[PDB]
Structure 1
């Protein structure tokens, strides 16, 4: 299987990347250094993760060390919800660029369709804990994203956690200048996303699967929660192919023509997780994994469920 997928901006995106949500700032520099050493060329970042400076130290050292060239790296970051106003988007991008010590991003995503009130708080709340929305709408934010392409700050723009109606809204935006290149969404055998993925692919939008391992370190994990890594049915498929469960869970989206971004700060796992290009799941394996769907989401916050733009009321 090829290692990159062609985007609708003409650039190629590595289909395996390293996630960095929850990667501790004191561990993620070494994690990214190790990742590049063992072959990763795509790093998934975000301002809200509060570790972009430390990710950048790693990227810069490996560029200076001549382990890799910048053109060979695919660095993604995301515009946080409190910066959807037109006048705040460039600054938000430039802070990400300064922290990552880059002069462009390969891909910048609108992190969520929901805009929040600007200010220092990433999740501004009212007295009863509802997030405070902003009045910006997604189409003006999108035009601000298009400006970043035209200023050379980013090579591609896209979206994340957009539902099909929301993707459609961007695609039908009056005066649309650049189509989203990517929609990054939660996707794994308990949330298989067939409808949203086929819609996006039919429009030439590449889908990135996040939390492919079910995010076992998410802060709100509950006993009763399903566990991909521990699911005996998936362990069995892994056993059959002489791979680990995680390797199965990473290969699965790759064979759906998705990009996948498993997170780890554990060197042995970082290496393990990249060793997924030398085996194939069968069609039957794939259909079996798809059958485990239960519409289970890692990422869906109660505090945002009344925002007008909350993406997960619609089926997809």
Structure 2
């Protein structure tokens, strides 16, 4: 298992990264410092996570300390939904660069295919509670992303939460200049995503699996919800390999040629989650894990089901 995967822009992306959604601003600086100290070279960020400044403090300290060189890091962020307007894309990227204290991103993603009305609110609502959409065509947003490559702000561009028809729309864009390098999507044994993954891979688009542990800290979690980390079948596979359930859950997407971005702010877990390059799940193990699919989606964007570009009505 090589540590990096080749992207269609010619750059190599570390297959393991640190997630930062929900990482409290008072804990994420140390989390990122620890991650870099124990070998992580890829950090997954977003403006909407409200902690890019604090992530940036950690990156900057580790660069200053010469623990790692900038070229060895792979920093990813994402364009929020309220910045899909073509004229707002560059400023959104620049704000993220300023907070992260970087002069380029390795990868910048359209966070969701749904554009919202611009403004200070991340989820602008009408008086009846519906999200207020943007009229900006995703193809125009893509053209604005391509400009960021040409102006040196980002090395690669990609998409997130795009269904196969939405990916296809980008791939079929008249005058397409740069293909998406990555589609970042939810993926774990309860939402195995075989159809979308095969589609993306067949087009040379690398898939990043998010919420690989089932996002047990998602704010809308219910006590009775399924729990990957507590699934006795997955526990048994872990025990067979003398690994933790989390380690199996992280190794699983790696062996499907995916990138994976588990989140933790706990130093012991950040280290545990990185120790996944010393064992191999069997083909049987892999198929068995795939068999647990229930089409259970922890990030379903229920707030936006009425939006014309809501991605999850389609089968895949």
Q: Shorter-chain TM-score: which interval?
A: over 0.9
Matches within 5 A, 1:1-316: 1-316=1-316
**How big is each residue's C-alpha offset from its partner over 1:20-45, in whole Å with a ceiling of 9 and x where there is no partner?**
00000000000000000000000000
1: distance between equivalents of 2:171 and 2:217? 35
Gaps of 5+ in 1: none
2: distance between equivalents of 1:283 and 1:200? 22
User: More displaced, 297-306 or 81-90?
Assistant: 297-306
1: distance between equivalents of 2:194 and 2:64? 42
Q: How many pairs align? A: 316
1: distance between equivalents of 2:271 and 2:119? 39
SS at match of 2:209: strand
Q: Give 1:301 deviation, angstroms.
A: 2.1
**How big is each residue's C-alpha offset from its partner over 1:43-62, in whole Å with a ceiling of 9 and x where there is no partner?**
00000000000000000000
**How big is each residue's C-alpha offset from its partner over 1:215-243, in whole Å with a ceiling of 9 and x where there is no partner?**
00000001221000000000000000000
2: distance between equivalents of 1:162 and 1:217? 23
Gaps of 5+ in 2: none
**How big is each residue's C-alpha offset from its partner over 1:97-129, in whole Å with a ceiling of 9 and x where there is no partner?**
000000000000000000000000000011221
**How big is each residue's C-alpha offset from its partner over 1:123-165, in whole Å with a ceiling of 9 and x where there is no partner?**
0011221110000011000000000000000000000000000
Could you tell me the TM-score, scaled by structure 2's length?
1.00
Q: Give 1:208 deviation, angstroms.
A: 0.1
SS at match of 2:269: helix
Could you tell me the TM-score, scaled by structure 1's length?
1.00
SS at match of 1:229: helix
Q: Give 1:167 deviation, angstroms.
A: 0.1
2: distance between equivalents of 1:33 and 1:224? 35
Two-structure CA RMSD over aligned residues (Å): 0.4
Q: Give 1:302 deviation, angstroms.
A: 1.9
Q: Give 1:300 deviation, angstroms.
A: 1.0
